[PDB]
Amino acid sequence: MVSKGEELFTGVVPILVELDGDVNGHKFSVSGEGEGDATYGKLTLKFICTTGKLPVPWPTLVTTLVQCFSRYPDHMKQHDFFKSAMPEGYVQERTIFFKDDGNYKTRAEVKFEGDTLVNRIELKGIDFKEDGNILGHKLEYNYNEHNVYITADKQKNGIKANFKIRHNIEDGSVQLADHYQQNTPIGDGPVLLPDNHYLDTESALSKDPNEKRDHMVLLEEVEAAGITL
Numbered sequence: 001m002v003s004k005g006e007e008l009f010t011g012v013v014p015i016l017v018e019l020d021g022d023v024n025g026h027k028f029s030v031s032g033e034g035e036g037d038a039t040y041g042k043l044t045l046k047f048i049c050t051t052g053k054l055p056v057p058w059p060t061l062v063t064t065l066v067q068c069f070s071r072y073p074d075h076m077k078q079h080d081f082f083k084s085a086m087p088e089g090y091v092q093e094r095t096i097f098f099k100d101d102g103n104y105k106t107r108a109e110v111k112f113e114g115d116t117l118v119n120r121i122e123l124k125g126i127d128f129k130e131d132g133n134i135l136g137h138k139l140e141y142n143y144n145e146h147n148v149y150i151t152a153d154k155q156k157n158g159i160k161a162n163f164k165i166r167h168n169i170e171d172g173s174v175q176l177a178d179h180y181q182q183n184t185p186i187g188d189g190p191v192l193l194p195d196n197h198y199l200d201t202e203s204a205l206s207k208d209p210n211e212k213r214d215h216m217v218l219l220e221e222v223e224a225a226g227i228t229l
């Protein structure tokens with residue numbers, strides 16, 4: 001295998017996610033747990049709002065709540081920055097602009113803590129409309145397929161990504177969320193700096209029928225693409 005970190009993902013890897021958020025002063029925390037199987041680009045996660053009621057729609061947090069679990073085809077193995085940063089991990093930073101509404105800024109560390117892949121996130125949201133699609137909870141509980149466009153950032157020894165998320169509104173219209181992303185290794189080791197490609201990212205949201213707490217069950221299937229065999 002072409003990076004040391006890539007070997008850490010040949011099997012099923014337990015995952016922990018911890019998020020602390022503050023959006024227009026509405027504070028919340030989310031904890032998630034599950035497992036990833038990057039061989040197949042798959043993961044399964046269950047998230048709980050540990051502070052009670054989530055003040056923003058669950059779909060708006062999907063992208064923030066581990067692209068190291070992507071399946072890179074055999075011919076694209078030299079382009080997997082995410083696994084190559086492991087186990088020291090990477091900082092993942094975004095700004096996410098909700099069209100005609102506010103923005104989230106996120107900073108996350110994704111790294112191994114023992115045998116667990118851990119995503120620890122801080123999120124700050126500002127300039128939201130209290131009666132908008134976000135703070136007004138007007139988004140459908142579903143998720144569209146999206147491509148995440150990745151380019152190398154030689155300078156920061158890292159990558160950049162941008163993409164637009166389409167969140168379905170309750171009336172069948174769409175709330176757009178423009179994502180800008182930077183990832184930089186935490187560790188000192190060499191990392192793989194990719195040619196241009198994308199992650200074909202499929203997400204399915206559901207509820208655990210036995211769960212009383214405000215929650216989201218998420219299954220994802222992601223494969224890298226865009227470089228011809």
Ligand SMILES: [Gd]
Binds near residue numbers: 201202
């Ligand atoms: Gd697809």
Ligand SMILES: [Gd]
Binds near residue numbers: 200202221222223
């Ligand atoms: Gd797919």
